[PDB]
Amino acid sequence: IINIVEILIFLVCVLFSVAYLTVAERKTLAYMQRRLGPNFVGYYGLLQAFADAVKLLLXXXXXXXXXXXXXXXXXXXXXXXXXXXXXXXXXXXXXXXXXXXXXXXXXXXXXXXXXXXXXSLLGSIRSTAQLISYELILTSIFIIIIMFVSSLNITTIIXXXXXXXXXXXXXXXXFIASVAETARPPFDLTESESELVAGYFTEXXXXXXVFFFLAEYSNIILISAFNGYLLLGGXXXXXXXXXXXXXXXXXXXXXXXXXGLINSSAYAIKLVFLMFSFIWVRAAXXXXXXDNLINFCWIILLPLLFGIFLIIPSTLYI
C-alpha cells in the first residue's frame, strides 16, 4: 500500500543497475585493452543496455533436444531465483542468512534442468557439478562468519561487522575465488562450445537470453553484494565511528536525511570495487578445463576451509 512504492523503486533501481552493468563490463574491459566500449548508443553510451535488450525480444524466434515448454522454462527460473535474492535483502527476515542459502541451493536446479542432444546435456551436467562444488564452499564460509557471530539474521551480521575484512581477508579472498568460479573465468570456459553448443551462452535462442543475462549480471551484483554483507564492510566510515564521526552528523543540523544515504553510498562503493575485481579477473583470466576446476576445489579449497573450522572454535575457547 505504502510498501508498494518502497518495493517498486528499489526493484526498478536494481533492474536499472543490472541492465547498465552489461555496458559497464564492456567499457571497463575496453579501457584495459586500450579501446572504447559502446561509443555511440547513448549519448554517454547509456542506451546500449536498452536498445540491445529491446532487439532480442523483437527477434522473437524450436528443437526437441529440450522438452517443448521446459526449453523456455530454465530461463524463467534463473531470473525468478535472482528476483528473490534482491527482495530478501530489503526485508529484515528474523532468520535471514539461511534464507539466502535457500535461494542459491534452488538457483543451481535450473542448470541440471537447462538441457534435460545427448552430449550437450552431458556438457550441462559438468556445469551442474562445477557450481555445486563452490556452492558447498560458500556455505562453509557463511558458517564460519556465523561462528564468529551466532545470530542468523543478516542484519545483526551487517551491524556487528569495528572490523570485517581484516580477520576474514583470507576467507574473503577465497570467497571471490569461489564467487567468480561460480560464474565468470571458469563458466566462460565451462560453456565449452563443442561444437556450436552453446555459442556464447546456453543456446540463447531469443528472447530467453534477455532473462538469462538478467540472472547472470543480476546474480553477480547480488552475488558480490552478499559477499559484502558477510565479509566486507557492510556500510559506514568505521574509523570515523571510532574517532567520533557524530561531529559531522550532530553539527550537520537536522533533516533525518543523508545519514540513510551515506551507508548506501559506501555499500555502492563496495559492490563497485568488487565488480571491478570481477571486471579484471575476466581480463587477466586463462583456462578452466573442468577436471582442472574439480581438482582445485574438492581436493584443495574445500579441505582448506575444513581445517579453518578446526581453528575458529578452538581460538574462541582460548
**At its nearest, how many Å lie between another protein and the CB of residue 273?**
20
Task: Determine if 185 is a binding residue for another protein (CB under 8 A).
Answer: yes
CB of 169 to another protein, least distance (A): 21
Distance from C-alpha of 257 to C-alpha of 261, rounded to nearest angstrom: 7
Identity of the residue, 203 or 267, whose beta carbon is nearer to another protein in the bound complex:
203
**Cell representation of residue 262:** 551515506
Residue 80 binds to another protein (criterion: CB under 8 A)? no
Residues 190-219 that bind another protein (CB under 8 A): 192-196, 198-200, 203-206, 209
Q: Which of residues 270-299 bind another protein (CB under 8 A)?
A: 282-292
Shortest reach from residue 192's CB to another protein, in Å: 6
Residues ≥6 apart with Cβ < 8 Å to 92:
153, 154, 155
Q: How far apart are CA 126 and CA 143, in angstroms?
A: 26
Toward another protein, which CB reaches closer, 115 or 165?
115
Taking CB under 8 A as the rule, does residue 105 contact another protein? yes
Q: Which range of residues in 3-11, 106-114, 161-169, 269-277 is near another protein by CB under 8 A?
A: 106-114
Residues 6-25 that bind another protein (CB under 8 A): none
Q: Which letter does DSSP use for residue 46 in this model?
A: G
Dist CA 111 CA 88 (whole Å)? 22
* Nearest alpha carbon to residue 130 among 242, 292, 314, 309: 292
Task: Give the residue with the Cβ less far from another protein, 200 or 306.
Answer: 200
Binders of another protein among residues 108 to 137 (CB under 8 A) are 108-109, 112-113, 115-116, 119, 121, 124-125, 128-129, 132
Candidates 102, 170, 248, 250; binder of another protein (CB under 8 A) is: 102
Stretch that binds another protein, among 81-89, 170-178, 182-190, 217-225 (CB under 8 A): 182-190
C-alpha span between 23 and 13 (Å, rounded): 16
316 binding another protein? (CB under 8 A):
no
Sorted by sequence, the CB contacts under 8 Å of residue 301 that are 6+ apart come out as: 134, 137, 174, 177, 178
Q: Which three cell numbers stand for residue 11?
A: 526493484
Task: Say if residues 223 and 141 touch (Cβ distance below 8 Å).
Answer: no
What's the closest the beta carbon of residue 312 comes to another protein, in angstroms? 15
The binder of another protein chosen from 72, 76, 80, 101 (CB under 8 A): 101
* Total interface residues for another protein by CB under 8 A: 73
Closer CB to another protein, 11 or 188, in the complex: 188
Do 201 and 209 touch, CB atoms closer than 8 A? yes
Q: How far is the CB of 50 from another protein (least distance, A)?
A: 8
Residue 250 burial (10 A CB sphere; 0-12, 13-18, 19+): exposed
Query: Could you say whether residue 173 binds another protein (CB under 8 A)?
Result: no
Cell 541440471 identifies what position?
Answer: 112
The CA–CA distances, whole Å, from 64 to 116, 144, 207, 253 equal: 10, 45, 18, 67
CB-side exposure of 55: number of CA atoms within 13 Å?
6
- Tell the residue number behind the cell numbers 515448454, with chain if given: 69
Nearer to another protein, 9 or 283 (CB): 283
Are the beta carbons of 288 and 190 closer than 8 angstroms?
A: yes
23-62 mask for another protein (x: CB under 8 A)? ---x--xx-xxxxxxxxxx------x-xxx-xx--xxxx-
Grid coordinates standing for 218? 543480476
Single out the segment in contact with another protein by CB under 8 A; choices: 13-21, 187-195, 213-221, 232-240.
187-195
